[PDB]
Amino acid sequence: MRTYTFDQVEKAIEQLYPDFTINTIEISGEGNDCIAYEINRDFIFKFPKHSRGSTNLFNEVNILKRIHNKLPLPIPEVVFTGMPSETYQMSFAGFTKIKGVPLTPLLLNNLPKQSQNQAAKDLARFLSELHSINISGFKSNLVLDFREKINEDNKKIKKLLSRELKGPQMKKVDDFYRDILENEIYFKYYPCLIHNDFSSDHILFDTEKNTICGIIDFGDAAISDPDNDFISLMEDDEEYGMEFVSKILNHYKHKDIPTVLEKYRMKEKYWSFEKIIYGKEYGYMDWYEEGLNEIR
C-alpha cells in the first residue's frame, strides 16, 4: 500500500551512505512489490511497498550475494543494502545496472544463425551453472511448495467462481485441478535455485559483439523446479519459442524433454486460471474476462 516521494528515497540512502552523491534520480518502473529508481544512470534502487515485498527484496539480495561470481554471465551486484524496519526486513537495495539491450524474439530472429546457436549455448551454460548450485546455502523457506500453491489457487478460484459458472463449466475447473494434483510429475522434481522469471525481457544483449551480456531481474528467484526456466522461454507469441528452446535444452543436456513439454502445456492452460486470480486481485478486468472465457 505504501508510497514514496523522491525526497524520502534520497534521505533513506543518505542515512546509510552519506558520501554517495546522487546526481540524477528517476523512476524506471514499478511492480507489485517494489518501486524502482534509477540513480546516476548507474544503479537501480528498489524500495518495497509492503511487508511481503520487503521480505522478497531481502531474499533477492541474499540470493544475489551468494551467486555473485558463481555464474558464466554478468548479473546484478548488490552495491547498497538498507536496514530492517518496524515491519520491513530490507528498507531498500541498490544494484548495478548491467550494460545491454533485451534480447527480444525479434532481435534474436534477425541474428546471423551462428550467433543464434551461440545465444542458445550461452543460455544453456548459464542455466546449467545456476541449477547446479547446492540448495544447502539458502534459507529453507525459499523452497517453493507447488502443491500448496495449487491448493491455495483452487480455493481462491472456487471462491471467486462459485456462484458464477454453471454445472458443466465448474466440472471442467474441478476436473482440471484434480488432474494436476494427481499428476506427480509437477511435484516430484529435484529442486534447485531457479531464476523463476527467465524470459527474453531479462536477457541482455551486446549488439556490437552479438553476444548475450547479462541476466537481470532475480526478483522472483527461488528454489523450485529447474524445468520452469525453460518453459518461460517456450511460448512462440512473446518468447523464443520451441525451436530455439530445444537448442538450449540440448546444450544443457536435459534427459527428459517430454516432461518439459508436458509442464509447458499445463502451464499454458494454467495461465487462464492465474488471469482470473490476479485479474481479480489487481483489478485487471481484461485478464478476468479473458480467463473466464478461456475456461468456458
DSSP readout, 94-150?
Answer: EEE--S-EE--HHHHHHS-HHHHHHHHHHHHHHHHHHHHS-GGGS-GGGB--HHHHH
Beta-carbon contacts of 227 under 8 Å, excluding residues fewer than 6 positions away, are: 189, 259, 260, 263
Would you say 52 and 33 are in contact if contact means Cβ atoms under 8 Å apart?
yes
Show me where the domains of the chain are located. Answer: 6-96, 100-296
Strands of 34-39's sheet, edge to edge? 25-30, 34-39, 43-48, 93-96, 78-81
Binding residues for guanosine: 98, 217
> Would you give the end-to-end CA distance of the chain in angstroms?
34
Q: Which residues of 53-70 are buried (b: 16+ CB within 10 A; e: fewer)?
A: bbbbbbbbbbbbeebeee
To which residue does cell 500448496 refer? 148
DSSP 8-state assignment for residue 5: -
Binding residues for Mg(2+): 202, 217, 220
**Exp. method:** X-ray
Give, in order, the Cα–Cα distances in Å from 118 to each of 54, 234, 244, 292. Answer: 37, 18, 11, 41
Reported in sequence order, the residue ranges of 69-145 that DSSP labels E, i.e. its strands, are 78-81, 93-96, 101-102
What was the resolution (in A) of this experimentally determined structure? 2.0
- CA torsion, points 155, 160, 165, 170, in degrees to nearest 10? -10
3-state secondary structure of 71: coil
DSSP 8-state assignment for residue 73: S
Q: Decide if 6-96 and 100-296 have a common fold.
A: no
Rounded to 5°, the CA angle 242-247-248 comes to 95
The fourth-level CATH superfamily of domain 100-296 is Aminoglycoside phosphotransferase (APH), C-terminal lobe (3.90.1200.10)
Binding residues for ADP: 33-34, 46, 96, 98
Give, in order, the Cα–Cα distances in Å from 24 to each of 5, 45, 166. Answer: 15, 12, 56
CA separation for the pair 223, 195 (Å, rounded):
9
Assigned CATH topology for domain 6-96: Phosphorylase Kinase; domain 1 (3.30.200)
Taking residue 211's Cβ as centre, other Cβ atoms within 10 Å add up to 15
Binding residues: 33-34, 46, 96, 98, 202, 217, 220
Reported in sequence order, the residue ranges of the chain that DSSP labels E, i.e. its strands, are 25-30, 34-39, 43-48, 78-81, 93-96, 101-102, 192-194, 203-206, 211-215, 222-224
Q: Which residues of 274-285 are buried (b: 16+ CB within 10 A; e: fewer)?
A: ebbbbbbeeeee
Positive or negative, the Cα torsion across 62, 220, 213, 116?
positive
Q: Rounded to an integer, what is the distance from CA 40 to the centroid of its chain?
A: 26
Would you say 192 and 222 are in contact if contact means Cβ atoms under 8 Å apart?
no
Binding residues for adenosine: 96, 98, 217
List of long-range contacts for 280-285, beta carbons under 8 Å, 24+ apart: 280/160, 282/32
Taking residue 181's Cβ as centre, other Cβ atoms within 10 Å add up to 14
